Design a protein around this ligand. Structure first.
Ligand code: Q6M
Ligand code: K
Ligand code: K
Ligand code: ZN
Length: 638
């Protein structure tokens, strides 16, 4: 029932700055805040967000993650002159103090709590806070790396105390390691901390041995801290997506968090002087999108780093775009991760194998400066178009609408009939072909309609008209559940077929991925592992212009179809056409709700069957040489 996105911001947090020459801190400027908000204003995103006000974090809230001694010392900084502020700043590592920074730090902390309360009270579905100073380096008794108070650490502890949450996920995609968060939740299994960061074999700041992949936590919390070190610069979109598909997402979806907090540092984007990575700002549209199915969309994005003012503004807009549900931009040129990234991904999965089900099979040997401006992202006039069987009135959300075959469209169905289906005059089945062409014409030719769902009776004729009409326009991904062959040719390079069936069928084709999941209670955990580890990696590298989902009537499927429909909307700008054979009121309502951008119910509780993981890893061995994004280990060299 929650809707809308909160944008917490206040220009007061830009009224402190570095007052002496210091090459280590010159990049942390107030302009990072003003450029970010002005970019959101230019693209119309701020106007679409609920402007929740900023407040000061109280002393009792600061003491949640900081000591009385450190709070008392920072509290005296407003009364210090420039000379005394230099003496206080050199007691810490790479951080400056201003006479207004204590005031702003309480605002940056209070802003994060305002976002947490807005999300947990269902007043908004998600939100982002544009705060300054950052926080993820701050520790219990020390300022560190431009950070005074650990804003994200506050949010997790705040949501624990005031809402009795048992599982909170923190995703730190800033290019630096948020060691302040790791120290805070080292022994806490209730707060899962994931962080990738420029490491370069401990040669990069903050040069900490505990920033490596071997630090998995301590005590009752071991396995709930996940560090992914980047040992070379220049990491690309393929490296970031490999990290998500093969490390973060498989852990996050079986952890099943009740709230997702993001340490959103954009110094991991291209052009940044600190990160020196090569990921485009568009990648953050998908990093946000792939996490939104978690915790029923309850996602609190908190700003951290980001120092290229041009790259910062573009990356912020791509994040808020996805938070508002706007379509995701297509990502081209995706392939395998580099050797250094595959090594880091390899080592993390190995050390985490003793803690998570998705990596359990790895433990035993019997099992195993200038870049182009991003395109304009615009939400469709109506997002989803539904056509139920004739005479079936349904209650649709405000994002949806029924079909009204035009005269030009009706002439198209006639010439198609008088060529391939000469003997076919069963009225309703013929009229379903008119709806398919009507929806597809509205999806591809204009930004009026994004996706749609069509209920059909005869499959082979319906899927043939759908696919052949979309091809005669570039590339279609087909995800079909059910058995038997379909009128789909995968000989050229225009179609990729994902089939989930019950009877095992040898593929012998590189453009086909057949998943034979054995019927059982663990079918939910098996499908989720194949979705994150196989289906999504090939779909993102394939980069289709349209997704065609097909569900035969003789469809277990109910629990996972919503998650697939949401996640798969990261492909093809969200343009997905779903063909459901037969009428299932529950399946159609679940399909339309996910297509319309609504939040999906969590899966909650596990571990899949070893025969399924064995089948899935055989699929990866057969396809990873063509689709490199499937690789999660370093390739063997001749
Ligand atoms: C939030 C954040 O992770 O971006 C903070 C970055 C800390 C920078 C460390 N000092 C490097 C000196 C550069 N010459
Ligand atoms: K990080
Ligand atoms: K932890
Ligand atoms: Zn950073």
């Amino acid at each position: 029932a929650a809707s809308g996105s909160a944008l917490i911001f206040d220009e007061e947090m830009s009224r402190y700055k570095l007052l002496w020459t210091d090459p280590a801190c010159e990049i942390e400027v107030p302009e990072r805040l003003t450029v970010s908000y002005e970019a959101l204003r230019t693209h119309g995103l701020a106007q679409r967000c609920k402007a929740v006000p900023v407040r000061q974090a109280t002393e009792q809230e600061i003491l949640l993650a900081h000591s009385e001694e450190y709070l008392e010392a920072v509290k005296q900084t407003p009364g210090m002159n420039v000379e005394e502020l230099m003496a206080f700043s050199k007691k810490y590592n790479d951080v400056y103090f201003h006479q207004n920074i204590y005031h702003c730090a309480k605002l940056a902390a209070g802003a994060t709590l305002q976002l947490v309360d807005s999300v947990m009270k269902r007043e908004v579905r998600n939100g982002m806070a544009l705060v300054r100073p950052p926080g993820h380096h701050s520790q219990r008794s020390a300022a560190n790396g431009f950070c005074v108070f650990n804003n994200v650490a506050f949010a997790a502890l705040y949501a624990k105390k005031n809402y009795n949450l048992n599982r909170i996920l923190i995703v730190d995609w800033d290019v630096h390691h948020g060691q302040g968060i790791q120290y805070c939740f080292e022994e806490d299994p209730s707060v899962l901390y994931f962080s990738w960061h420029r490491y370069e074999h401990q040669s990069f700041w903050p040069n900490l041995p505990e920033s490596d992949y071997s630090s998995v936590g301590k005590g009752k919390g071991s396995g709930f801290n996940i560090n992914l070190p980047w040992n070379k610069v220049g990491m690309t979109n393929s490296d970031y997506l490999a990290a998500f598909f093969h490390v973060l997402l498989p852990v996050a979806y079986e952890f099943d968090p009740e709230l997702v907090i993001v340490s959103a540092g954009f110094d991991s984007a291209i052009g940044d002087p600190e990160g020196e990575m090569c990921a485009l700002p568009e990648i953050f549209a998908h990093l946000t999108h792939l996490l939104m199915p978690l915790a029923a969309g309850k996602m609190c994005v908190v700003l951290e780093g980001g120092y290229n003012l041009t790259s910062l503004g573009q990356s912020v807009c791509q994040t808020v775009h996805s938070l508002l549900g706007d379509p995701t931009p297509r990502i081209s040129g995706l392939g395998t991760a580099c050797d250094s990234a595959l090594e880091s991904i390899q080592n993390v999965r190995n050390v985490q194998s003793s803690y998570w089900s998705s990596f359990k099979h790895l433990a035993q040997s019997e099992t195993n400066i200038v870049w182009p401006e991003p395109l304009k992202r615009m939400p469709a006039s109506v997002r989803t178009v539904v056509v139920p069987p004739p005479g079936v009135e349904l209650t649709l959300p405000k994002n949806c609408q029924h079909s009204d075959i035009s005269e030009s469209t009706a002439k198209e169905v006639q010439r198609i009939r008088d060529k391939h289906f000469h003997d076919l005059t069963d009225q309703n089945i013929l009229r379903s072909l008119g709806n398919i062409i009507s929806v597809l014409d509205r999806m591809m030719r204009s930004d009026e309609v994004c996706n749609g769902c069509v209920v059909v009776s005869d499959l082979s004729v319906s899927v043939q008209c759908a696919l052949q009409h979309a091809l005669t326009e570039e590339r279609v991904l087909v995800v079909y559940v059910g058995d038997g062959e379909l009128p789909v040719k995968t000989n050229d390079g225009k179609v990729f077929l994902v089939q989930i069936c019950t009877k095992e069928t040898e593929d012998k084709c590189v453009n086909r991925l057949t998943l034979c999941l054995r019927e059982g209670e663990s079918l939910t955990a098996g499908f989720m592992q194949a979705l994150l580890g196989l289906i999504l990696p090939v779909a993102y590298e394939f980069n289709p212009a349209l997704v065609l989902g097909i569900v035969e009537e003789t469809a277990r499927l109910m629990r996972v179809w919503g998650h697939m429909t949401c996640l798969i909307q990261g492909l093809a700008r969200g343009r997905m056409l779903t063909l459901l054979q037969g009428y299932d009121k529950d399946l159609l309502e679940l399909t339309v709700s996910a297509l319309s951008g609504a939040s999906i119910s969590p899966l909650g509780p596990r571990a899949p069957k070893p025969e399924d993981v064995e089948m899935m890893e055989k699929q990866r061995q057969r396809l990873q040489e063509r689709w490199g994004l499937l690789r999660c280990t370093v390739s063997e060299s001749w």
